[PDB]
Design a protein around this nucleic acid. Structure first.
Ligand SMILES: [Mg+2]
Ligand SMILES: [Zn+2]
Ligand SMILES: [Zn+2]
Lengths: 133, 67, 137, 48, 263, 49, 32, 39, 394, 113, 56, 147
RNA sequence: GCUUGUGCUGUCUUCGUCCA
């Protein structure tokens, strides 16, 4: 079902030029050297410095034309506060245990740096990012 | 030439207020105060009466061509 | 009166305020510090009198690029207004008359002597500056 | 030759009812009538 | 579910508040009142003599723009839908103006009160030019000096502002919602501070300003709409509002009839 | 009007000169071939008799 | 009498709940 | 001439406006030049 | 002037008395809608119709042989709107998304998944633009050595016809070589390229119609701190020019080789004044916010440049006649309002005010002299250029 | 000279139907409706009424050219419901809303007069 | 003036306007210009009905 | 009056034009792209001063080389209850929703020029020819052809 | 018994329009 789970602490929140988009940098509590850079929508999911986020990555939401979800049906997204859908445009096989995954959620960019052991399963075309706080 | 019947922008009838405007200006009221008295609030309507030039008074000074 | 040849021997103040010795919106005047003192012989009556008939119609010409002033001086002679008040008794080859001439809301002092308020050649339109539907590109 | 050429006519039906005109061309039933105020000429059947 | 609240009421203007309606419904009502409510206006002018200093089409255009009483115009028929020959009493109103200057000095003004109704529908309140009072002279039409006369015969027909703006019952419809910009439908241009560089709306006191610690509500929609309807005198404001609603209902019913007949 | 013609045209007669100040309009001039050759009198200008 | 003839302290009591040189009052005959 | 009533009224308005302009514009210009001088 | 001034179009019969053009073909014709007129020629034979439709048709003329780059691009408010709509913080709701998707003629009927699914479904402008891009298109550009995370949203990356990052602007949908139009023309052919023009124009025009864009007097007004900085820069430059004048008047000036003392002095003063105008303009342009409308138009590449902002907001600068400062047309002075032998910047044609601030009469006259120079130069060189072109063709 | 008659904006020709419905076979249960002699006033009303229905999955409209008085609507519904029935329900619902709005306005006007 | 370039028939001229709702290779033509200009089409069995409708 | 010439591209009716909160619709919509390259700041200053004059009932003095500044006009406009820089909140005519951007809005003096499209439109299929060359004649009045 | 008619100057000059 899911491909990756972890808990991060936000080191920095960079608003920059934009009013609705912020770039956050986080590091996994359990396993260091696993970094996360992510663009999020401030209005619908505001985050502050030193917050704790539960980030989950999945290739599907189950338990081609989009339609508004019926209230009756249920999906993985019901457990989280913020869900995005993107495409992986670069899977970098770099150093011995340095793997970078670049995802683009409609122009909102994410880079997940980590080891091959954790990120081996992230070699997909599309990914969902589910965030809980 | 002669005061337009309607305001160009919104179409309020301004063609019945020319003589009252001249009367108010005769009494000594300022142009803005006179326009306020005639209930012309939007500046589109105020432009119609404030910038009108009455050319028909010059055209009427020529003798009639048919009698 | 002075002609162009006699102008080479006189010293002219631009304004009567120039005869006696930090705002971001007001224009800045020359210092003229090269001379310790100045003995003016003449003074301009008003600097806006250097313009002709067609350029006296432009509002705020000192805030425009000069080719646009030239273009307006050309185009203002092709505007439709009321050329004479006796157009009904005249038999001209062509003649255009505007239904409802209006005097401008922004005017210059030179327009008083050009009779522009009595025989105007335009109308005050309410204008928005906007990309509405792509039909004004 | 029709007896209705260059004669003042009035329109009684359609979208131009009650407008005065002059017949300019008349070949087969589709009389061409110029309108006095709109500077235009319009086709119209003879019935109207 | 929809609610109406009236703030100010007059013969020629009403200021109301619409709530629990969609934005599209309010905008369609505004558009219908502006362009689709039928009135009565002069459409044909027969000029028997005109020796004034004004051109014939000039005077005809001025006559077209005079507002006439259109209270019973719903019972009248459209000229193209009337089977009659030429113009009859069921699809037109005939007015006549005859003016002249007597004397060899001075100038005579021709007002819209000089228009006299000669024929029209029986017992219907349509045709007379609108007048604010009994002593009001109306709209200035022309000016005459000695030996100048104007003699015309006008025909008033029913129509809508889509064909020509002379048939519009309204002048301007103010329209506004969300004075405090809680929905963030506009992004305010500023130099230093947007709050103090923009004037407050006239309905800003009708809604509670947002709290400083409040967060953006993404589930909200526009709910309350403020609008003022100003009329030219051809119809009263309540009449314009009711007939706009009726016109929208008739358009929807025509769509429904076409759908059911399509089978 | 300055009768210099079209043949042998040069920029120098068409130029706006320093001595034109207050005597001819710096703005009003035709576009094209007569640019700078046709001039218009300033508002307070006069001609000696 | 006018606003000028009013006492300065009473003029101070007239508070809106100065003319500028570039707002002229309109004319119809002009001059020249 | 036998001038019209509207034209005579406009002439009176023009005279009053000319006098008022000649007073107010000159006073405002004097206030502006003295303020620019004292700076 | 070139073979793209005559192209074959398809007729659509329409009311009113004007000819109607798509706005992307106004560049090869060098036409605008302020009074221009154009001619139309009707073929009278089957062979001639085939020649027009197979050789001279507009889609076949997109890429020109003169510079092996396109001559038609996205222009004017479509360019401004495509820059505004593809910003990172542009989000669109479901109803407007449905309207924009239905506006695309080549849309296949499948609505894409939103970028954000929870709490509220939101699409971005990049997705809606990618809908108008045909599949199988790959494009990659690097701006300022940006990385693959693109912190400033510059550069460009398109994968299978989908925009991954980068603001779409003149560098992507303009007429330059290596852009989206050139790639689509090479990969899919002229027909798909013309449909790409139509799709992009329709989507961006709808979004801009429902968003809005304006410009006002406040967009040329810089705050007080920047105006203080600009005034300080101009005053320091004038003091530098005064020092140069004193050095030249005391024989302490270095002579540029191959030039006289007067020529070197004039060149050095002109260089100082040009640097002053550039510095003041750079300060003014750095001051501007992102919401500034002039900045938005300049950044889209649709109209205006840096010099326009500099002259409108900070300083018009030095007026040049025949490549030199204003000459001494009177006896040793430029105007009778100066004294003799005056070499200060204001005496010889330096305009220190902006267009917003207003020019003084001396600056007005000098600026008019420079504009007259421009008009004469154009209206004189046109005939020589035409004669050279005719001889080359023959 | 080339200006069309102003009554052509709202008068329906004899040979031109008010309403033409064709299916859109690309996706299931979708129809394309062409409205003649109508504009944004009816289009926006119908679209934003239909967009709130749970069984309507897609609704949009476009006016192709402002010089022609027509618009085209695309409507897609769930498997159980047919798009024409949804359109009829939307028309009836807006009619009912306008009816109660008129009633309440008349009541309030009578109260305040 | 008469051999390398000349005046020709079947041509039109008028002012140009912009249209965001036209295709790249399309041109909008006034109805009067379309009535004035003509194309001679050969009558075949593929188009005789349409051509006689045009003639009517 | 600032060298900004143009032709009508389309006409819209009252209910289709954008409107302000008080119901005012423009008589004219011009593109923002005409302003920055031609640098006609006097157009915007004239529009602001005309808005102030029409609100207060005065005629604005636009004589060159005076002491007028944009900030004085802005202060006067602000005191009247409008945004000091001439911007207004506008609504879309088609939908009734607010526009995200605010629109510079005010009265400007325009003039109608002598060049009209119905005096220039001209088509020729066949017609009169010259006697000497048997080529089409010159001129729209003579039913001539194009060269 | 009564029937619908079938075309256009030349040569200069000036002022303009859109590019350049
Ligand atoms: Mg042009
Ligand atoms: Zn108005
Ligand atoms: Zn009848």
């Amino acid at each position: 079902s899911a491909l990756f789970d972890d808990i991060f602490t936000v080191q920095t929140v960079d608003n920059g030029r934009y009013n609705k988009v912020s770039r956050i940098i986080g590091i996994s509590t359990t396993n260091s050297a696993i970094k996360l850079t992510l663009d999020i929508n401030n209005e619908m999911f505001p985050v502050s410095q030193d917050d704790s986020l539960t980030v989950t990555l999945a290739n599907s939401l189950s338990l081609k034309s989009w339609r508004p979800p019926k209230p009756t049906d249920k999906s993985l997204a019901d457990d989280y506060d913020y869900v995005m859908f993107g495409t992986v445009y670069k899977f970098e096989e770099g150093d011995e245990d340095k793997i970078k995954v670049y995802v683009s959620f409609g122009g909102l960019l994410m880079c997940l740096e980590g080891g091959y052991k954790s990120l081996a399963s992230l070699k997909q075309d599309n990914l969902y990012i589910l965030i809980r706080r | 030439m002669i005061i337009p019947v309607r305001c160009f922008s919104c179409g309020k009838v301004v063609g019945d207020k020319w003589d009252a405007y001249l009367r108010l200006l005769e009494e000594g009221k300022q142009e803005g105060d006179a326009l306020d008295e005639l209930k012309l609030k939007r500046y589109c309507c105020r432009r119609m009466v404030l910038t009108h030039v009455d050319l028909i008074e010059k055209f009427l000074r020529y003798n009639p061509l048919e009698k | 009166y002075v002609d162009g040849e006699e102008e080479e021997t006189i010293m002219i103040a631009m304004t009567p305020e120039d005869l006696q010795t930090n705002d971001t919106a007001k224009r800045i005047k020359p210092e003229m510090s090269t001379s310790s003192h100045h003995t003016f012989t003449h003074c301009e009556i008003h600097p806006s009198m250097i313009l002709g008939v067609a350029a006296s119609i432009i509002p705020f010409p000192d805030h425009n690029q000069s080719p646009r002033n030239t273009y307006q001086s050309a185009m203002g002679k092709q505007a439709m207004g009321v050329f004479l008040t006796n157009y009904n008794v005249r038999m001209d080859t062509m003649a255009n008359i505007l239904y409802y001439p209006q005097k401008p809301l922004a005017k210059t002092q030179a327009m008083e002597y050009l009779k522009f308020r009595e025989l105007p050649a335009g109308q005050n339109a309410i204008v928005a500056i906007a990309c509405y539907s792509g039909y004004n590109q | 030759r029709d007896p209705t050429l260059n004669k003042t006519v009035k329109i009684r039906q359609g979208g131009y009812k009650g407008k005065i005109g002059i017949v300019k061309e008349a070949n087969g039933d589709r009389f061409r009538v110029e309108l006095h105020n709109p500077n235009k000429t319009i086709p119209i059947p003879c019935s109207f | 579910e929809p609610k109406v609240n009236i703030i100010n009421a007059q013969d020629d203007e009403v200021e109301l508040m619409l709530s629990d309606v969609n934005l599209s419904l309010a905008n369609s009502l505004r558009r219908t009142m502006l362009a689709e409510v039928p009135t009565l206006a002069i459409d044909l002018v027969e000029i028997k003599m005109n020796t004034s200093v004004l051109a014939d089409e000039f005077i005809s255009h001025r006559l077209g723009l005079i507002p006439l009483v259109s209270e019973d115009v719903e019972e009248m028929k459209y000229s193209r839908d009337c089977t009659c020959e030429d113009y009859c009493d069921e699809c037109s109103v005939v007015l006549e103006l005859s003016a002249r200057h007597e004397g060899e000095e001075g100038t005579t003004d021709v007002y819209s009160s000089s228009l006299i109704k000669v024929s029209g529908p029986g017992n219907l309140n349509v045709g007379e030019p609108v007048r604010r009072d009994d002593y009001d002279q109306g709209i200035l039409l022309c000016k005459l000096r000695n030996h100048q006369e104007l003699n015309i015969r006008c025909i008033a027909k029913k129509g809508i502002a889509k064909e020509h703006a002379k048939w519009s019952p309204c002048s301007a419809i103010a329209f506004e919602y969300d004075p405090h910009n809680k929905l963030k439908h506009t992004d305010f241009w500023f130099e230093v501070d947007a709050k103090k560089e923009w004037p407050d709306s006239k309905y800003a006191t009708w809604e509670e300003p947002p709290k400083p610690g409040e967060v953006f509500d993404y589930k909200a929609k526009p709910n309350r709409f403020y609008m003022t309807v100003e009329t030219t005198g051809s119809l009263k404001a309540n009449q314009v509002f009711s007939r706009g609603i009726k016109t929208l209902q008739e358009k929807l019913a025509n769509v429904l009839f076409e759908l059911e007949n399509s089978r | 009007n300055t009768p210099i013609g079209r043949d042998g045209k040069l920029a120098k007669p068409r130029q706006l000169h320093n001595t034109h100040w207050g005597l001819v309009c710096p703005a009003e001039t035709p576009e094209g071939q007569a640019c700078g050759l046709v001039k218009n009198l300033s508002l307070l200008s006069g001609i000696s008799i | 009498l006018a606003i000028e003839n009013l006492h300065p302290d009473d003029r101070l009591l007239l508070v809106d709940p100065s003319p500028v040189f570039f707002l002229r009052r309109p004319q119809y005959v002009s001059d020249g | 001439v036998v001038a019209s009533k509207a034209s005579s009224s406009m002439l009176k308005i023009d005279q009053r406006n000319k006098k008022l302009n000649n007073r107010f514009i000159r006073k405002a210009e004097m206030a502006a030049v003295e303020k620019r001088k004292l700076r | 002037l070139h073979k793209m001034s005559m192209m074959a179009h398809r007729v659509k019969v329409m009311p009113y008395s004007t000819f109607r053009l798509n706005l992307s073909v106004t560049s090869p014709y060098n036409a605008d809608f302020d009074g221009d007129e154009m001619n139309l020629h009707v073929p009278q034979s089957e062979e001639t119709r085939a020649e027009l439709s197979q050789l001279c048709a507009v889609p076949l003329q997109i890429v020109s042989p003169q510079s092996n780059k396109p001559v038609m691009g996205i222009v004017q408010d479509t360019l401004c709107g495509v820059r505004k709509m593809t910003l990172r913080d542009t989000f669109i709701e479901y109803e407007q998304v449905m309207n924009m998707l239905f506006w695309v003629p080549s849309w296949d009927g499948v609505v894409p998944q939103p970028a954000i699914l929870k709490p509220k479904p939101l699409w971005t402008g990049k997705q809606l633009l990618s809908i108008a891009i045909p599949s199988g298109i790959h494009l990659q550009r690097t701006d300022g050595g940006n990385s693959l995370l693109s912190p400033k949203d510059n550069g460009m990356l398109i994968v299978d016809g989908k925009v991954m990052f980068g603001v779409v602007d003149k560098k992507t949908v303009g007429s330059g070589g290596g852009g989206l139009i050139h790639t689509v023309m090479r990969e899919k052919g002229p027909k798909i390229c013309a449909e790409l023009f139509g799709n992009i124009q329709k989507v961006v025009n709808y979004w801009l119609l429902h968003n809005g864009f304006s410009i006002g007097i406040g967009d040329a007004i810089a705050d007080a701190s920047t105006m203080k900085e600009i005034t300080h820069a101009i005053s320091s430059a004038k003091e530098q020019v005064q020092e140069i004048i004193y050095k030249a008047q005391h024989n302490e000036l270095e002579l540029k080789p191959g030039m006289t003392l007067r020529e070197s002095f004039e060149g050095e003063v002109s260089r100082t004044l040009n640097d002053a105008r550039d510095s003041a303009g750079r300060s003014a342009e750095m001051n501007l916010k992102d919401l500034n409308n002039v900045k938005q138009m300049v950044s889209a590449g649709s109209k205006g440049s840096f010099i326009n902002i500099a002259q409108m907001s900070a300083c018009v600068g030095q007026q040049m006649v025949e490549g030199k400062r204003i000459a001494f047309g009177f006896a040793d002075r430029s105007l009778p309002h100066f004294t003799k032998d005056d070499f200060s910047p204001e005496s010889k044609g330096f305009v220190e005010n902006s267009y917003l601030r207003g020019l003084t009469p001396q600056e007005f006259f000098f600026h008019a002299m420079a504009g007259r120079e421009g008009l004469i130069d154009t209206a004189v060189k046109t005939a020589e250029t035409g004669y050279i072109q005719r001889r080359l063709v023959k | 000279m080339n200006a069309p008659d102003r009554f052509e904006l709202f008068i329906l020709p004899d040979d031109v139907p008010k309403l033409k419905i064709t299916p859109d076979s690309r996706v299931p249960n979708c129809i394309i409706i062409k409205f003649e002699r109508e504009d944004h006033t009816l289009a926006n009303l119908l679209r934003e009424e239909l967009a709130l229905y749970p069984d309507v999955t897609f609704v949009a409209y476009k006016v192709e050219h402002p010089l022609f008085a027509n618009f085209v609507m695309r409507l897609q519904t769930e498997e159980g419901t047919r798009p024409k029935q949804a359109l009829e329900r939307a028309c009836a619902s807006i009619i009912n809303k306008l009816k109660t709005l008129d009633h309440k306005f008349n009541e309030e006007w009578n109260i305040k007069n | 003036g008469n051999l390398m370039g000349k005046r020709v028939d079947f041509s039109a001229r008028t002012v140009i306007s912009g249209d965001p709702n036209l295709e790249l290779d399309q041109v909008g033509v006034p109805i009067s210009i379309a009535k004035t200009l003509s194309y001679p089409e050969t009558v075949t069995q593929y188009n005789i009905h349409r051509l006689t409708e045009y003639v009517r | 009056r600032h060298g900004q010439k143009g032709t009508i591209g389309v006409t819209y009716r009252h209910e289709d034009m954008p409107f302000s909160a008080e119901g005012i619709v423009p008589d004219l919509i011009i593109n923002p792209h005409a302003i920055p390259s031609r640098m006609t700041v006097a157009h915007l200053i004239e529009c602001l001063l005309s808005k102030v004059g029409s609100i207060r009932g005065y005629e604005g003095d636009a004589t060159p080389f005076t002491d007028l500044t944009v900030d004085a006009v802005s202060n006067l406009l602000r005191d009247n209850g409008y945004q000091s820089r001439g911007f207004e909140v506008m609504y879309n005519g088609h939908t009734g929703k607010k526009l995200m951007a605010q629109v510079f809005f005010g009265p400007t003096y325009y003039q109608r020029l002598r060049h009209m499209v119905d005096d220039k439109i001209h088509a020729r299929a066949r017609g009169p020819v010259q006697v000497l060359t048997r080529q089409p004649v010159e001129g729209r009045s003579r039913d001539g052809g194009l060269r």
